Amino acid sequence: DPLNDPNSPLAKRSIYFDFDSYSVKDEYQPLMQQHAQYLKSHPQRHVLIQGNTDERGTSEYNLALGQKRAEAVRRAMALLGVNDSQMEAVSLGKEKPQATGHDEASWAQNRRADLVYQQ
Q: What is the residue type of 101? A: G
Q: In the chain, what are the domain boundaries?
A: 1-119
Per DSSP, the three-state class of 51 is strand
Q: Classify each residue of 8-27 as buried b or exposed e, where b means 16 or more C-beta atoms within 10 Å of its C-beta.
A: eebeeeebbbeeeebebeee
Which residues are CB-neighbours of 103 under 8 A, at least 6 positions away? none
CATH topology of domain 1-119: 60s Ribosomal Protein L30; Chain: A; (3.30.1330)
Q: What is the residue type of 115? A: L
4 class by beta-carbon count within 10 Å (0-12 exposed, 13-18 middle, 19+ buried): exposed
Strands 87-93 and 47-52: parallel
Which residues are CB-neighbours of 40 under 8 A, at least 6 positions away? 80, 81, 82, 83
According to DSSP, the residues that pair with 89 across neighbouring strands are: 49
Pick from 44, 57, 49, 12: nearest CA to 31: 12
Pick from 101, 110, 99: nearest CA to 20: 110
* H helix intervals, the chain: 29-41, 59-79, 104-110
